[PDB]
């Protein structure tokens, strides 16, 4: 392979925004892989937003640009030394609240 360690760490940060979007319930883990693939190709929000909009043109362009923006910042944080598993802990708690009904007293 060429850049998988960055794709595995970037895929976690990319999912943090896709899983957080309120209009993103299905195709959320598979959509981050294509976002990282565009980031690995070069990292151009214009070409990365136009490529994601061509396949995902149902949600407002701002929602797609929001996930590409967090992947660009993640590339700079990953190059210095950041952790992606810690972000999943916040998504697991936020994702459980979205589907956590009939669980109170």
UniProtKB/Swiss-Prot annotation:
Q: How is it modified after translation?
A: Methylated by HMT1.
Cysteine disulfide links: none
Q: Where in the cell is it found?
A: Nucleus; Cytoplasm
Q: How does it assemble?
A: Interacts with MLP1. Interacts with PUB1.
The note filed under miscellaneous reads: Present with 9670 molecules/cell in log phase SD medium.
Q: What does this protein do?
A: RNA-binding protein involved in RNA processing and transcription regulation. Acts as a regulator of mRNA stability: binds the poly(A) tail of mRNAs and pre-mRNAs, preventing their degradation by the exosome. Involved in the biogenesis of circular RNAs (circRNAs) which are produced by back-splicing circularization of pre-mRNAs. Involved in mRNA poly(A) tail length control and nuclear export. Functions in surveillance and the packaging leading to generation of export-competent mRNPs.
Hey, which family's this protein in? Belongs to the ZC3H14 family.
Which comment does the entry carry about domains? The N-terminal domain is required for nuclear export of both poly(A) RNA and NAB2. The RGG domain is important for NAB2 import.
Protein name, UniProt field: Nuclear polyadenylated RNA-binding protein NAB2
Species name = Saccharomyces cerevisiae (strain ATCC 204508 / S288c)
Parent protein range shown? 1 to 105 of 525
